[PDB]
Every structure is written in structure tokens, then in C-alpha cells.
Amino acid sequence: KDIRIGLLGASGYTGAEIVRLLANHPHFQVTLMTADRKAGQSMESVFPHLRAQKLPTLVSVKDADFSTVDAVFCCLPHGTTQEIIKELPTALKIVDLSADFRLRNIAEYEEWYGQPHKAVELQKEVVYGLTEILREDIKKARLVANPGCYPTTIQLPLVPLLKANLIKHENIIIDAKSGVSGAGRGAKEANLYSEIAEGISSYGVTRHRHVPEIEQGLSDVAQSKVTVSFTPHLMPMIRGMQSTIYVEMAPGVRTEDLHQQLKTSYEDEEFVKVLDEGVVPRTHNVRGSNYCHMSVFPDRIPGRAIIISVIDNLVKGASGQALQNLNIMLGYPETTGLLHQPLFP
Amino acid sequence: KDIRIGLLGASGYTGAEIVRLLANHPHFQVTLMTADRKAGQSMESVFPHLRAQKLPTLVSVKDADFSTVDAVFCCLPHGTTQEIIKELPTALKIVDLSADFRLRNIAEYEEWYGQPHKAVELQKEVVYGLTEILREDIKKARLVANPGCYPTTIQLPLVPLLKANLIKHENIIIDAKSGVSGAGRGAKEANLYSEIAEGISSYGVTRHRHVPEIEQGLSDVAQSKVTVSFTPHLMPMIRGMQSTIYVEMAPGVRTEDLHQQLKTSYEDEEFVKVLDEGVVPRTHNVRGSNYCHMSVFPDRIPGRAIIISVIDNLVKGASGQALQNLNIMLGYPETTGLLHQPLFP
Amino acid sequence: KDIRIGLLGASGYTGAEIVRLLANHPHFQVTLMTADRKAGQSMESVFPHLRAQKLPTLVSVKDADFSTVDAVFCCLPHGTTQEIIKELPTALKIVDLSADFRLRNIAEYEEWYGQPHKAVELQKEVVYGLTEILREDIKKARLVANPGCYPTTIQLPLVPLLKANLIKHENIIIDAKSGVSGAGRGAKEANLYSEIAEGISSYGVTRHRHVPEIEQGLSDVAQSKVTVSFTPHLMPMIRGMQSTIYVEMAPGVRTEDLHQQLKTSYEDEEFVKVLDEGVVPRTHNVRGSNYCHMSVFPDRIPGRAIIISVIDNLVKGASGQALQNLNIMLGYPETTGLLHQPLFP
Amino acid sequence: KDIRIGLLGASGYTGAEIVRLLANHPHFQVTLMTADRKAGQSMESVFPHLRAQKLPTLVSVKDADFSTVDAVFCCLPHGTTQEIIKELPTALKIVDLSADFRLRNIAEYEEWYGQPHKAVELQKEVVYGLTEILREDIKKARLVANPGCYPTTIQLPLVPLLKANLIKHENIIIDAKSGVSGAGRGAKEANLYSEIAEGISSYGVTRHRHVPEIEQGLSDVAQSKVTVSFTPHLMPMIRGMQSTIYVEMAPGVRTEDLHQQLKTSYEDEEFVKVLDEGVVPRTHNVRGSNYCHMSVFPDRIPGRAIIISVIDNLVKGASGQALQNLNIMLGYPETTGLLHQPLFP
């Protein structure tokens, strides 16, 4: 095909999704795939579900000439991406699914990710990949830092509201949920079927790494420092993500106003659906898709409102959005290869 | 076994749990079971997993005679409990698992249920069955309204904290989660394995019938009306529940105080357990038992705390606590038959 | 788009699957749908996961104008399919997902379904929709009976083997499994999440309607009446379907011969993959795709072999195969709208 | 209270299960516990759900003296047990839950295990722990080999049937299914929730370690070499196990006879249950507890029948029978501390 894709760290779930999504993309084509321990192996022996496809052999990052492709999808772990990306060709449009360029504050990166920022310089040219919000900058960006799943369900619904001054910036409490696929494919005892199902549990209480990402974006729009609470929970399900967002509306504002602002901000946006007031979204309905459904409800507390936002954490919350961004970055229609219908039931 | 037990409405999940629980209870024996459309059938017919024990033929409550019965576990379908209980022979210890005798305020009951209260006078002698809290009243109470599942996880950690003014009573936000077993065994579209599996949903938003039961308690301890923001979330699992609670500490108060307070209130309690600092509880760890685990964490927002309380929605959230009550309501050790240890994995 | 699609009975998983499969289909675009029990309602009110699509409002069968459609997919309720289809307009390609036109022997239809065939003559022009095996007739048929899900897993690897007399037709023992989605969306106790989750059980032991359908296809090749043993099992999962088949090898035959025959028979087939010897299939690998995988292994019992055939029961086991049949009936590319990559994880 | 019990190999799910079971055993109390790899840690730190239990701190086998305990349960890894049980004081009653003493034929041990046997002589005084079949030998015995999971569900129906010459011992084909809890807590990619959920799989095809164990049990009864076909299947669930068994009845034998025979054999059995003809058992019926169900069904194939047996793979399929065996090795009632009722749902 017309476009050769470089996919770093292809043995993980987001890599697998990058392979699945590109499969029905009439333009792009995976020609180079990187893996660490599984190098020197057909991805078939890694992800047999992809057997209908004929892909390249997995090689190590060290053994790969990046002059091989046009654009790069980076799905490597946080803290291993900065020195790699900085050492990549300049004529390469890049979309790293990792969090090594989402935060502009160098010191902030270090305090939350435990080590100095390596590509301090490159950083300032990076655009945050929240498509429906920064589309214009994403279009002309060379390097894009695909957002994190959770932060995606938060900013999309909250940004427009804060921009319209429809909600206060203080006391925003976020109670989020995610399938265990968000934990990755690492062979950890904690993630076994017997340690995930038939029970639920919180995690990342207080100091969760998605906090600065959330607060940054909201601060930009509120033009003031925003401090929130964020308590994610781990579900005995594979795919899906929901954030139950408890906010205080601005003086004199009613849920109807929040609903209208959201409805107006996303009325022509394919991937963001604002449900009719009162309607409850289910992650089941966006599962295996790139869509995000959101709804507005009154809080039993005066002046407060309840926002619910759901996505398939692996798609709109990962590789789906990444593809969405590369699409426009390369000048192709934004929805190319992104119109899969939900796999419900 | 000297105590003869009557189970009114044995074809549901609460009825089944009662039978299961009493099976190895040293002093209580099920001698009477009633069902509506199952009258005439054996229990094994309805619930075949109970086939190891001898149980009485299922008769109609209308033809039941309490001459040789000594205590009642009423699990009748919301709508007939009110009148059936009023007309029950006065001279026993009736543990009501329905919600009909929970609210002390007739008006509130009317409001939250539309229909008029049908046993206004008897309502005055009912005691709320949140054991650890109202133990002394329950031991000598006639009619006991067993708390609802969610309310149990909410009041246990909060009542102590309010009684000590360690946390403010306003802006208490509860983001609760529950397994689908709490939706009973009714044959409905939204309860089929296919519909429920994978994914969660926010049901009963803004208003849910547990709200008045929650506020009641909290209000009775705060000596002032309490208005919370409670939100149910259905989990793709059978058992377990978590009410992640967000509270504002009282001036000068720190997480340690709340931690020490709870640590001291349930210190010698067999069922309420407080975990160390920073330890996140899991519903997986209480599944199948009558234990509630609770933990306190600081919220990222200055002055706020986060409390997590988990139980097995059907045990401590229902049939287990009901039996915990009937024990004392009969003069036995409060833990008799309730020592079942978690079924993990 | 070129072809207008008529879907009768779109309120079930079959119809939802049709609608999902046709969403990104370039030539066929649904424009008519029926669902008496929900006529006038929106598709979003039945299957909200389809909200990104704009579909015609649901109608009644007696109201739909079957002259406005070029092709139809039939999901009528078993027992009501014959009359509706037999009376369907003249010009029209028809694919029935029901089992009512599968059996080519009216006598067997009655003794297995308890009712006479109401479209005897029409039955004669019907071609069994097991694609890879009957493609030739399918292309020129006007009315196709889409096969059952289980029967597909069995006939696919067995027909080719029986062809070349590689296996005896005596004592073919089948042990299959399907996700509960095969039970449909009917609101019944048996299929409640709490009743199905975390457990399995056989069903349809000894006798089961798919039996005659399976034997019929195998009988075609064996040129002799085949009598099998077929046992269904209900799996605690939504989609997916596997068949574990135990067969006797004919004199002189080795497992390698069965493998070679299958590899040769399906080497060009897009949707039927024959795995390498010793490799085990996983329904997880053909979940949400039209893809099918199979593998053969030696039995510990000398002379016997094992044949595992997996599919997504909602795809090749139903609608996926349905569409595979219509594509070629209308002379379109058989793979059109059917190359969806598996959803994994 | 009286008997002091230790626990060697208190690390996997079988160890945690033994403790759960003894947690309320009226006459046996756990006073010792080994977990070398994790010695110096609290049992809770490994299994938080056991927090309510006051348990002995984990000690190394090296640092453990077996004069304080009266009997020992062994849950050590395979290939490590023979040496330990080798050097134990005969004043100890022992129950090994490993595979190390199940097969009497030393050669077979080495072939199916890759390593030499290291306890020839001792192996001669070992009794096979299928309690309801070898009870008498188990009582008057010191050492006991606790049967495997699958082998238990198979030998229970077949042994009595073969003993009464009611079924032929040729072509015995078993298609088994098991929850993923049986694989253990080991950190394996394959057993992650994201890899296991919503899909089943076959494994141990043709050859599986339980094969020799199963055949030895059946061969000893039939008094002839019995070669079976046995194919395990991994279920996306925690507990539960079913071995659908296809056999051929003896000349002039009807399913009525097999059924009627199972009745005689297990007429006064608390744990094994022969269901009424036509009733299909479900792993949900005995899940959590130490029960199993099984009946006989006619096959569609001539002189064949389909037997189904279910058990929770962790209880009667592991630590439950072990205790059943020890109770009678110490002279206490066989049901002592094993009357736990199924946790259904």
C-alpha cells in the first residue's frame, strides 16, 4: 500500500490493536514490527488471532532502519520512548502511544515518572493527541503523544464545559473504571483470571500517573490551576472504560445547559456521541469501537451534576485514537479504518 | 437444634443464602419455607444445589401455621411484606429482609415508593438491623428491618466518623458498585448472561431507593439532615460491592484521625475490619463470607478523604447480617453459623 | 449503495449482527427492517450500540413493502418462517437463518420439530448454505437455508474427510461448546448472568434438533445414513464456539492423511484455516470475525483421531455465513464486508 | 482443639483451600505451615482474604519440626515431594496431594514425568485416596496418595460400572472441562484474565499427565489394560469441572442398569450424588463446596451412554477429598468439617 507503517513495541495489546485497525485501512500498511523478548518470531506465535494476515517478522529496535517507513506508531513502555524517539529520523511523522510527551512541564514529568526528561527539546514541538479538541494542531504536528485512556473520557466531556464556564474548576471528583486489558499483557500474578474476576478493587489511589495529564489539559482551558481527585477501579472485564464525573455547576447553571453545550460541541463529530438527557451509557455499547458515549445528569446535591463518559480503553483510549491522529497527520480522512461497529453483545 | 426457623419467600437468592447459611448453624433449623408460585414443590426443584440437605416442602404463606416456628426471616416480594408481617403472630423475632420497615418516616416511604404505608403503627416498633451499630437495640427488638446491601457498606464507616465530627456531613459523594446477584433472580432481558457480561453501567442515577435509607442513618447520627449524592454501578460479576466514598474531613482533622477512629470503633468487631494505611481492599477478599473490609486514604484534594468498604452483597449485605441479628434476637453468640471464610479464588 | 437490504426480525442478536456486518458494506445498505414486538420504535431503543448508524424505523411484517428491497435476510421466529417466506414476493434473493428450510426431508422436519412443513414444494428449490461446500449451487439459488452454528463446525472438517473415505462413518462422537449468545435474547431465568456465570453444563443430551441437520450433510457424502453422537454444552462467555470431534480412521489411514486432506481442501479457502499439526485452536482467536480455524490430532486410542473446529457462533455459525451466501447469490465479491479482524483480547 | 495439623506446600490455591476447609473443622487445627519461597512472610500477605484467620507465620521445610503436628497435607510442587515425604517420622499420618504416589508402576512414573522415581519401597504402602472407593484401605493406612481432579470425576462413575461388567472397557472417550483455577497461581501469560476470558480451549491433547492415573484406576477394576481417550478443556471460569464420558455398555445392558448400579454403590454417600435419570448436572450445583453429581444418559449411538460428572476443581477436586481422606485416617467421621454448602449462585 501507499503508506509504510513503523510499529515499535508490537507484542503488546495496543500493538495488537494497531495491527487489527490497519488491517481494513485501505491506505496504510505495517511493514516493520518491533518486539523485545519475542524478537525473531512470527507475530502469529504471539497473537494467533492475527493469522489471516501476513505480517513482517518481529525484529528488535536495535535492528531496524527507520528509513524503512513513512510514519511511526510507538507502543513501548513509558521511560524507554524518549531517547528512542529523539534518535529517530526527522522526516518521520510519529504517533507514540506512550506517555513520554503528553506533559509539557519537564519537572512534572520527572516527579510523576521518576526520572529526568530525555528529549526536553523535542517536547516543545509535541501536540497532545486528543483529536476532537486539538485536531488543528495535530494536523501539522510531527510528533504526537497519544493520550492515556482515562484522561480521554475526562477531557472530552469536561473541556467544552470549562471553556463555556458552565462548571467550577474546584471539587471535581473522578471515579473511573477499566477492564484488565489496560494492565497489559505482562505475566503478572495480580492479573490472572483468578485475580481479577468476581470481585473489583480500586488502585492508583491518590498518586495515579494519569493525574497530571488530567490536570494539565483542564488547566489549559480553565486558564487556572485545576486540582482534582481521581480514583480508578479495575474491572473483571477485558475491554471498556467509564468515568463517573462528579462536578459542581457554575452559579445559576442547570444540567440542561451542560447538555446543550456538549450536544453543540460534538453534534457533527463522528466519534463522540452525546446521549439524550437521562440516558445511561454502557461501555458494552462502544466495546470494540472508537466511539465515546457521554450523558449529563443532575446530582441529588444542588448545583452539582453527574457526567458519565465511556470508551473501549484499547481503541478510543489507545490505538484507535492514535490511528485517528496519524490519519489526519498524513492528510487522509480522519475516520479511515475507524468505522468498526460495536461488538455488542 | 432447638430453634425452629421459618423462611417466607424461599425461591429468591436471599432465601437460598439463608438455607445455605443455616445448613451448618448449630442451633437453628429451617422447619418452614413458603413460596408463591412454587408452593407444593421441593426446594431442590427450584434450587438443585441445595440437594444435600433435607428441607421442608414449599407451602403457601397463606396456609402456613407458626405453631411450631420460633423465628422469621421474611424475604417476600416488596409489596406484600407490609401486610403479611402485620398479620403474623405477635410473639417471635421477625427479621425482615425487605425494605418496607426500614424507613421510620411514613412520609418518606410514601414519597420514595409512591404507594401508601400499610402498617404505620407496627412501623413504630421496628429497629434497624445494622448490627455493629444498633446491637444493643436489636438484641431486645421485636421486629427488625434488615438493612439494604449498599447501605450497610455506607453507614458502617461513616456513622462512627460523624458521631465524632471527624468528617463534615455535607458533600458526601458515594460512587457505589455491585454484582448483578443483587438484582434478584427475576427473568428479565437486562439480567441474561449475554447482556450483563463485560461492561458496567450507572443504573439508578440521581435517585435510588437506598438514598433515604442511607441519609436516614447518617442524619440520625449527625443530628442534622444529610443529603448525599449516591450512585449505583452494576458490575459484570455475581457477588461483591464497593461504595467508594468521598468525604470532606472536619477542620484540623487528618486521615490519621479518621483512620484511628474507625480503627477504634470496630477494633473488637468480628466482621468489620480496618486495614493498614494505604492498603486497598478488594471485594474478591470477602466474597462468600459475612466480612466487611474498610480502608481510608487521603484524597488529592486538600481536606478530603476516601473510604472504601466492601462486603459480599448477599451475605453481609443481606442474609448474613439478617442471621447475625436473629442470633442475638434469640440469645446466642452473634457469630454462630457466620464464620464461613472467603471463597477465594 | 447498489443493493437495498430487507431485514425481518431485527430485534435479536442475529439481526443486530446483520446490521453490524452490513454497516461498512459498500454495496448492500439496509433500508427496511421488521420487528413486530417493537414496531415504530427506533433501532437505538433496542440496540443502543448501533446509535452511530442511521437506520429505517422498525416496522411490522404486514406493513413492510417487500417490493422495495432487492435482497432479504430472514430471522423470523422459528415456526413462522415458512408461511412468510413461501409467500414472499417473486423477485428476491432470500437467506433464511432459521432451521425451517435446512432439512430436505419434510418427514424428518415434523418428527424433530413437532409440526408439518408449510412450504413443501418451495423446500425443493432450497440450497443448504454451508458455503465452502455448496458454493456452486448457492450462487444460483434464490432461497438459501443458512445452516446451524454447531452443524457448521462439524460438517466443514468432516465432509472433506468423508469425501476421500479417510474416516469411518460409524461412531462419530461430537462434544461441542458455544457461548450463551446462541440461546438468544429471550428473557429467561436459565440464561441469567447469575445462573450461567462461572459454570458449565451439557444440554440437549441424546437428542437435539441440530442432529438431523448434521447427519444429513454427512450422509450426502458417505452415501449412507450417518448416525452420530452430538452433545452441546453452555459456556460462561457470550460469543464463541468450538467443536471437539472424535473420529475413527479408515484402514491404512494416519492422522497426517486427515491433515493433508483438510489442508488441501481448504488451502484456497479464505475463511477456513487448517492449523499445523499439534497446534490447538482457541475460540478467542476467531471472536468477532468471520474466520474459522481447525486442527487434527491423534487419539490415544489406536486408530482414532481428534478434530477440533472453532468458530464465532454469531458469525460463521450464523449471520456471517448467511452473508457469505448472499454475496455470491448476487454475484458480488464473497469476502465483501466479511474481513473483520478478530477482537482480541 | 485436639489434632494439630501442619501444611507443607502452603503456597498454591490448593494450600489456601486446605486452610479454608480446616478454618472451621471441629477437631483439626492448623498449627504449622510451609512456604519456603515465601518464608518470613505472613500467610495474609500472600492471601489477604485469609486475614480473619490467626495463622502461624510461614516456616521453611528446613526450619520445620514434624513432632508438633500429628498429620501432614502435602501441596509441594511435582518433582520435589518424593524427597521430603521420604524423610518424615512414621508417627505422622500423611496425605500427599501431588502426583508422586498415585501410580504404583515406577516405570510409568518416569515416562510420564521425565524424572526417576525416588521412593520405590515406600510407594508400595501407598493407598489411592478415592475415598468412597478405597475408604477401608485409606483408614487402616499411614500414607495416602490423594487423587487428581479429572481422575476423580472419571473413576467414580466408571469403576463401579466396570466392576459390575456393565460397560466395555474399549473406546472409553472422555471430554473434560475445568476452571482455570486448577492451573494454579503461577505467573503465566496464558492464564491472564485478558487471555482466558470469553473463550475455551483444549489442552493435553493425546497425552496428559492424568492419563496414566486414570488408566491405572480403571485397569485395576476391569482387571485388564484399559486405554482411554481423554481430552481436557480449559473453561473461562475459576472453579468447576466436568468430564463428559462416552462409553459403550455391555451386551444386553441398558442405561437403566448403569444408572441403577450407580445408585447401589453410592446409596449412603454424603459427597457423591447420582441424579435422577434425565436431570443434567451443572458445575454450578456443587461449586465452592466438596460435592459432585453424576447420572447415566442413553447415547444416540448403539449400546452407548453418556455419563456426566461435575465437581469444584479446588475442593473435591483437590483439598476437600484430601481432608475426607484424613478424617478417616484419624478415626473421625468422614464428613467432619466438609459439609460446606455450594455457593450458588
Curated annotation (Swiss-Prot), chains A, B, C, D:
Keyword annotations of the record: Amino-acid biosynthesis, Arginine biosynthesis, Chloroplast, NADP, Oxidoreductase, Plastid, Transit peptide
Main location: plastid
An example Gene Ontology molecular-function term: NADP+ binding
Enzyme Commission number(s) from the entry: 1.2.1.38
GO biological process, alphabetically ordered: L-arginine biosynthetic process
Catalytic activity: N-acetyl-L-glutamate 5-semialdehyde + phosphate + NADP(+) = N-acetyl-L-glutamyl 5-phosphate + NADPH + H(+)
Source species, domain of life: Eukaryota
Pathway assigned to this chain's UniProt record: Amino-acid biosynthesis; L-arginine biosynthesis; N(2)-acetyl-L-ornithine from L-glutamate: step 3/4
A GO cellular component annotation in the UniProt record: chloroplast
Transmembrane segments: none
Record localization: Plastid, Chloroplast
Cross-referenced CDD domains: AGPR_1_C, AGPR_1_N
Ranges in a coiled coil: none
One Pfam family, short name: Semialdhyde_dhC_1
NCBIfam families registered for this protein in UniProt: argC
UniProt record similarity statement: Belongs to the NAGSA dehydrogenase family. Type 1 subfamily.
Subunit text: Homotetramer.
Official protein name in the record: Probable N-acetyl-gamma-glutamyl-phosphate reductase, chloroplastic
Organism name: Arabidopsis thaliana
